[PDB]
């Protein structure tokens, strides 16, 4: 069991680039591939299923910024993100995209259009900002000063540069920033996060950013969490029966926490579940753009090629999502995009659940219903309730 996270507001970390430790080569760097038999003149299917050639016809993004927190970008005239930092190389700047990852989000929140397929992304007029947070090819090299706490883990690590990214991002004057990281641990395990709820109440309450988060895969690290129990209508959203902290899910609703659906509109084995978690999109079989500009739907695998899945993917959809909102309604706060994205979603059974939160989003809807614009910040309290 677990209480939702604390915000100390004032443990806000410095403005620095650079990896929490230094990084040294763990694998060779990858580059995306495509899948047999692809027919890449047809619109893929995420773009038919979220009507984003309708949704475009209302914004594209024009005017607004997007911070991608991610992998790096190779960027392209396609792709075209702009140096936001490095926080896994002492020496980079954002633009080295060496996990075939970081690419295809920017791609799927910016991507531009072409002539001779049928990709485009959510908002094809945003400026990118890429900043590369995480990486699989380069991690922490020397060995654990203490190998039993808790803030010398990787996990740890990569949550203390990730909050320098978003005070970064912010500065920036990224209006809508994307995080690919979804860094699990267990309740039992406490790491000191308090640098970023900072950072994200920096960055939402003081500078005025969407912040939309993935869910997290489900993996080695992250374990399934259990659905709540029904004995237990005092805990509806099953609080008491989480297993696996998501960070920085679980900063919800100061954040749009993003989980996966297939095809055929299910949510997916892989995406985690939980209490934080608040709206959904397609994570599955996807179509984007590669370190040319060109199309791409799937990353080299050890039998073959495997299509292109994942909470963040489903996450850069939501993003671009609030880019379209934010040219469209450039007077809403953070909180009022978000609850927009959220009202107008197609919710599951229930109203809310733990797998798509408010459910599967609906560019079209966010775009053109009108609505109650409710609170200009997310609600707080201060006393905690009984």
């Avoid at 075209?80 to 930092?85: F, K, M």
């Avoid at 197609?346 to 599967?360: C, E, L």
């Amino acid at each position: 069991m677990i209480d939702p996270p604390v915000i100390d507001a004032g443990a806000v970390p410095p403005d620095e680039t650079g990896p929490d430790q230094p990084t040294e080569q763990r694998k060779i760097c990858a580059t995306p591939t495509v899948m047999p038999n692809s027919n890449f003149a047809d619109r893929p299917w995420a773009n038919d299923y979220l009507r984003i050639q309708e949704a475009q016809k209302f914004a594209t993004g024009a005017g607004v910024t997007v911070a991608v927190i991610d992998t790096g970008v190779n960027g392209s005239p396609r792709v075209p993100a702009e140096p936001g930092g490095d926080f896994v190389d002492a020496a980079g700047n954002g633009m080295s995209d060496c996990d075939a990852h970081g690419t295809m989000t920017a791609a799927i929140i910016g991507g531009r259009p072409s002539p001779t397929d049928g990709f485009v992304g959510m908002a094809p007029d945003v400026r990118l900002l890429s900043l590369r947070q995480t990486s699989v090819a380069f991690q922490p090299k020397g060995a654990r000063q203490d190998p039993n706490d808790p803030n010398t883990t990787q996990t740890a690590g990569s949550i203390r540069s990730l909050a320098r990214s978003v005070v970064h991002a912010a500065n920036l004057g990224a209006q809508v920033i994307n995080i690919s990281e979804a860094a699990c641990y267990k309740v039992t395990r406490r790491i000191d996060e308090t640098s970023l709820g900072a950072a994200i109440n920096y960055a939402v309450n003081v500078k005025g950013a969407v912040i939309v988060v993935a869910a997290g895969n489900t993996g080695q690290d992250c374990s399934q969490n259990p659905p709540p129990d029904p004995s237990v209508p005092s805990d509806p959203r099953g609080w008491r029966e989480v297993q696996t902290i998501v960070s920085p899910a679980w900063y919800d609703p100061l954040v749009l926490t993003v989980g996966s659906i297939g095809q055929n509109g299910q949510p997916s084995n892989f995406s985690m579940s939980g209490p934080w978690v608040g709206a959904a999109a397609p994570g599955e079989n996807l179509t984007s753009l590669g370190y040319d500009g060109q199309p791409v739907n799937a990353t080299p695998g050890e039998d073959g090629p495997v299509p292109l899945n994942g909470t963040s993917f489903s996450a850069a959809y939501v993003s671009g999502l609030a880019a379209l909102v934010k040219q469209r309604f450039p007077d809403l706060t953070p909180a009022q995009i978000i609850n927009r994205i959220t009202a107008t979603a197609r919710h599951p059974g229930g109203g809310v659940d733990n797998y798509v939160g408010a459910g599967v989003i609906d560019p079209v809807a966010a775009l053109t219903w009108e609505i109650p614009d409710g609170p200009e910040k997310a609600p707080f309290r201060v006393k905690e309730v009984p």
